[PDB]
From Swiss-Prot, chain A:
Keyword Lipid metabolism carried by entry: no
Cited InterPro entries: AceGlu_kinase-like_sf (IPR036393), Asp/Glu/Uridylate_kinase (IPR001048), Fosfomycin_R_FomA-type (IPR024192), Glu/AcGlu_kinase (IPR001057)
High-level lineage: Archaea, Methanobacteriati, Methanobacteriota, Methanomada group, Methanococci
NCBIfam families: IPPK_Arch
Protein name in the entry: Isopentenyl phosphate kinase
Site annotation Transition state stabilizer: residues: 15
Length: 260, 249
């Protein structure tokens, strides 16, 4: 039973406030994760868990200084300074999250993409260590990070890039997207379920002018779950117990199911 | 083309003092490395450089808490806490070193083994990222770290493990070992060179062993010199011989 939980939205950090940390939320989230891990142990049910988080007010604020738009394209500059500066900011955010998780006795450990991942048409991302960590009951905590590509450039790898890749690569049984909203909003209300019988209808809706989310973020999550034939929930990570419940397999928000 | 400089734990920290940093040495070292890189580009000569450092006085203090004796071997315990605590200690040391290097405009970046390296039947160490970084003229800084061991569960990979592996894996032209001694000491005296000739007698007399061993198993070529002596590191990066030379072809 492998579950990958993405702590997204702005539940851990306010992107507006530089280097801000939502301490209270982070601690509650840690509490719920611990509560869930304890539940599984008592129910004698095995559970492998991978946590993924973005840069929050740590990554983007730093990366922006090294980002430029040239010929209508994103390009990283002055990276002889920028690669490290971004790595440094992410490392700090990851330290804080892992330290907090460990304070509730969650066996979290650090996975830093910038050290070994290469952004190509097909990511070079060795999961050997991660597999071994999960075998020994550790909880790998992977974060969005700056990474080099295979074309003389760089790229910010995000949680949205990381979750699908690992979901497929490790054959996760469940994907959990903790966000700032209640689910995939159709008429300002989370649609209970998205599957092979309504996905296109939902994606076209999301592409419409009546869509609460026009960022295409939900569309991408849905598309990747279909692609890798996974099952996942998109829910509000800000609501007490949602994370605990989602980790127990209880549908929260919107269920996206394409598992075979 | 590619040189791999190893900074001995002894010259960056004090093993006798947990969480110790030899600030002046570190800064001198960074400065010398900076001057060397400037020398090459001034000659318009392209030089790829990878830096490696051990856990110094950060690993042991913490790792010791998670290392026990089953009878005569090393046993890792409570790694649900220990893996992160050791990672954290190593990350702290690495940050300090890279921040110092960056303060001298050395384009250093962090390579954390714990996140992707696996010990055991054949080292699993993906170098794709490092290769790309070297093409950007970035200076990867790799460090000793706790890593998963598919056989023994856990293992503290050291600079002596990393350097040769990368030396071979990246076809490095020069291997440099900056340490606190004038070279490999035999009867308290630094030997000028170690070849296929005196190697036999040197191996019986004999960490330099485990070190001279793998540099042998990879037909590498390197110099073991004193990193505490002003300008040795600078001179060594310019291809100059310093201390004990081990040119195994
Ligand atoms: Hg899947
Ligand atoms: Hg070699």
């Amino acid at each position: 039973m492998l579950t990958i939980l993405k702590l997204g939205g702005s539940i851990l950090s306010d992107k507006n406030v530089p280097y801000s940390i939502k301490w209270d939320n982070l601690e509650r989230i840690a509490m719920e994760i611990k509560n869930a891990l304890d539940y599984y142990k008592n129910q004698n049910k095995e559970i492998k868990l991978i946590l993924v988080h973005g840069g929050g007010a740590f990554g983007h604020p730093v990366a922006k200084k090294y980002l430029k738009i040239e010929d209508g394209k994103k390009i990283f500059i002055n990276m002889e300074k920028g690669f490290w500066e971004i790595q440094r900011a992410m490392r700090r955010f990851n330290n804080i999250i892992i330290d907090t998780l460990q304070s509730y006795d969650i066996p979290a450990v650090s996975i830093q993409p910038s050290s070994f991942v290469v952004f190509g048409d097909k990511l070079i991302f060795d999961t050997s260590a991660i597999k071994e960590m999960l075998k020994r009951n550790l909880v790998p905590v992977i974060h969005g990070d700056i990474v080099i590509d295979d074309k003389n450039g760089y790229r910010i790898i995000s949680g949205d890039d990381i979750v699908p890749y690992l979901a497929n690569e490790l054959k996760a049984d469940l994907i959990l997207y903790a966000t700032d909203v209640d689910g995939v909003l159709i008429d300002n209300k989370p649609i209970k379920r998205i599957d092979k019988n309504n996905i296109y209808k939902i994606l076209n809706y999301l592409s419409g002018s009546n869509s609460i989310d026009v960022t295409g973020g939900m569309k991408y999550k849905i598309e990747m779950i279909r692609k890798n034939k996974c099952r996942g929930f998109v829910f509000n990570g800000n609501k007490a117990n949602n994370i605990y419940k989602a980790l127990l397999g209880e549908v929260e928000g919107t269920e996206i199911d394409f598992s075979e």
